[PDB]
Amino acid sequence: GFRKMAFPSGKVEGCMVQVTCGTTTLNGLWLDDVVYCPRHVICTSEDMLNPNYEDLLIRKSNHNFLVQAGNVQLRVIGHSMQNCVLKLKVDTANPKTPKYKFVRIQPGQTFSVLACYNGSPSGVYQCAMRPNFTIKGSFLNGSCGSVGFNIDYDCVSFCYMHHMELPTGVHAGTDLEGNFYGPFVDRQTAQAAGTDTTITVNVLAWLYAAVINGDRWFLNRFTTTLNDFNLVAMKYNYEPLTQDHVDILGPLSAQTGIAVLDMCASLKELLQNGMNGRTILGSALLEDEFTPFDVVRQCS
Amino acid sequence: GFRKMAFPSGKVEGCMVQVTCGTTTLNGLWLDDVVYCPRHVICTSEDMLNPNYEDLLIRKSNHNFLVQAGNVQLRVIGHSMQNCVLKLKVDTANPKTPKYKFVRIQPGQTFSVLACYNGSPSGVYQCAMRPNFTIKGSFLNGSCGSVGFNIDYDCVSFCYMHHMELPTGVHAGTDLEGNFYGPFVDRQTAQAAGTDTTITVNVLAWLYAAVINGDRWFLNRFTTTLNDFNLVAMKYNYEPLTQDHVDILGPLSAQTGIAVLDMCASLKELLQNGMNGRTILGSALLEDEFTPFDVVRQCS
């Protein structure tokens, strides 16, 4: 009904390379003359259990990193480690380097992931950073190093790089500076993610998208306050709604003629009574990976 | 849980242009020196009610078609009409023309749509041609001319071009030769699409993807025949399952150890009893826009 839309992947496709060290092959990000990759490419399957990356990196040479961009084989002329991201300096400046920034997103924000395997793009899809800093995406073997990004009018804002898949099936990664999102570490260990919650401001924006597209059955004639909505939202493991969230939902409220607190009263009834066998925008569940900015970008 | 994945849009991004004739602006496909666009760009809002395209095209000149590719303004040196697609011949060969084919897909098959507005790519998403030859996608004003495609190892198989949005909210289009999918015509009229049905072979492939990812609760210990499954599927408006569909599901059956007719018995119980408040791959509804080839491409 209202489809998840990913950013055009053209600017990022010309930056994906294949990085191999021993038996381990993953993906890398080829900005001007720097190939960014997860630092655990230097780790054997045994080393991942308790790696000492500083001692492991010293054991490594430039010739131990085989980098390939399509067919062109790139020659590493240096390697340095930012916190958990390896930086392999190459002889060749990427002639397809776009205008880019390195940003660290907040929990609840969305981004597009260019899933690639052994350096070649396979697909693109829209993600959302869960409140517990995990990603429910599709990452196979060979998927490590694939990056998440947003695009602002000519600029690619790189926001995420996939690093590990937790034993619970969820995925964890870092920003392009090597800092992990959440309490996770690049070590093959039992790591517990926090209690995940539903992004409340995203559900409200998705409900506004339903009203814009003619799906209006869930609108009611009860109202609520921000205080009393939250005490209901906390019971259903929904994130607390702030006045900042009410402010970001402003443009959608003016377009539909439905106050933000009026839509929250609609959401409160949906949480307490369910859907009663009906659907919203073709969905039987409440969707929470559409930010308010994602909705206004599609429903302009 | 198991995400819809769209093809990388890089090869198609370098072919999208903006075509304007009067007040009407839509998107065009710039292959070597040919800009493909819906022929109703020559129609005013009044002309769309009952257009005579042959008489309307004669009234038009080369200088009435303003084509823009980013900033470069392309000079039309000729216009010809394939059945419902306008072909504007330009002075400049597109230097970003990829290897491409023109294909006409079957109902139930999937493809990626590069949604663009006034010639500039805005997003990409995965579609499926409904059995009634409609598309439930996201097409705004300025969305006309955006193309659907698949990629086979270096080749872009263009399969669809958006033309109209029916009064019922669903979308209709043509192949790249100008032949409409379904009984629809490029005229602003009341047009009824057929009774839509669920793509049964796609639901079965999606159930195999659930088994591959550990979601196994729906597997049961009843069996069925292809004849007796269909007589249940016809009641729930599901497409009839053929032996060809059973053959395409072969690779997924061997990987999971579940016979195709065994999975159909699982689907029969889901149709008759429902989900009973549970989910499959994070979904409360049965998903039918994953072809068997889409599943094996993600679950390799």
Swiss-Prot record, chains A, B:
Effect of P131H: In strain: Omicron/BA.1, Omicron/BA.2, Omicron/BA.2.12.1, Omicron/BA.2.75, Omicron/BA.4, Omicron/BA.5, Omicron/BQ.1.1, Omicron/XBB.1.5, Omicron/EG.5.1
Activity regulation information from UniProt: Inhibited by pyridone-containing alpha-ketoamides compounds 13a and 13b. In turn, alpha-ketoamide 13b (tert-butyl (1-((S)-1-(((S)-4-(benzylamino)-3,4-dioxo-1-((S)-2-oxopyrrolidin-3-yl)butan-2-yl)amino)-3-cyclopropyl-1-oxopropan-2-yl)-2-oxo-1,2-dihydropyridin-3-yl)carbamate) inhibits SARS-CoV-2 replication in human lung cells. Inhibited ex vivo by michael acceptor inhibitor N3. Inhibited ex vivo by compound 11a and 11b.
Positions of the Peptidase C30 domain: 1-300
Cross-link (Glycyl lysine isopeptide (Lys-Gly) (interchain with G-Cter in ubiquitin)): K4, K89
Effect listed in the UniProt record for changing N141A: Does not affect ability to cleave and inactivate human TRMT1
Regions of this protein lying in the Cytoplasmic compartment: 1-300
Protein location: Host cytoplasm; Host Golgi apparatus; Host nucleus
Reactions it catalyzes: TSAVLQ-|-SGFRK-NH2 and SGVTFQ-|-GKFKK the two peptides corresponding to the two self-cleavage sites of the SARS 3C-like proteinase are the two most reactive peptide substrates. The enzyme exhibits a strong preference for substrates containing Gln at P1 position and Leu at P2 position
Function: Cleaves the C-terminus of replicase polyprotein at 11 sites. Recognizes substrates containing the core sequence [ILMVF]-Q-|-[SGACN]. Cleaves and inactivates human TRMT1, preventing tRNA guanine(26)-dimethylation of tRNAs. May cleave human NLRP1 in lung epithelial cells, thereby activating the NLRP1 inflammasome pathway. May cleave human GSDMD, triggering alternative GSDME-mediated epithelial cell death upon activation of the NLRP1 inflammasome, which may enhance the release interleukins 1B, 6, 16 and 18. Also able to bind an ADP-ribose-1''-phosphate (ADRP).
Subunit structure: 3CL-PRO exists as monomer and homodimer. Only the homodimer shows catalytic activity. Interacts with host FBXO22; this interaction promotes the proteasomal degradation of nsp5.
Name of this protein: 3C-like proteinase nsp5
Record organism: Severe acute respiratory syndrome coronavirus 2
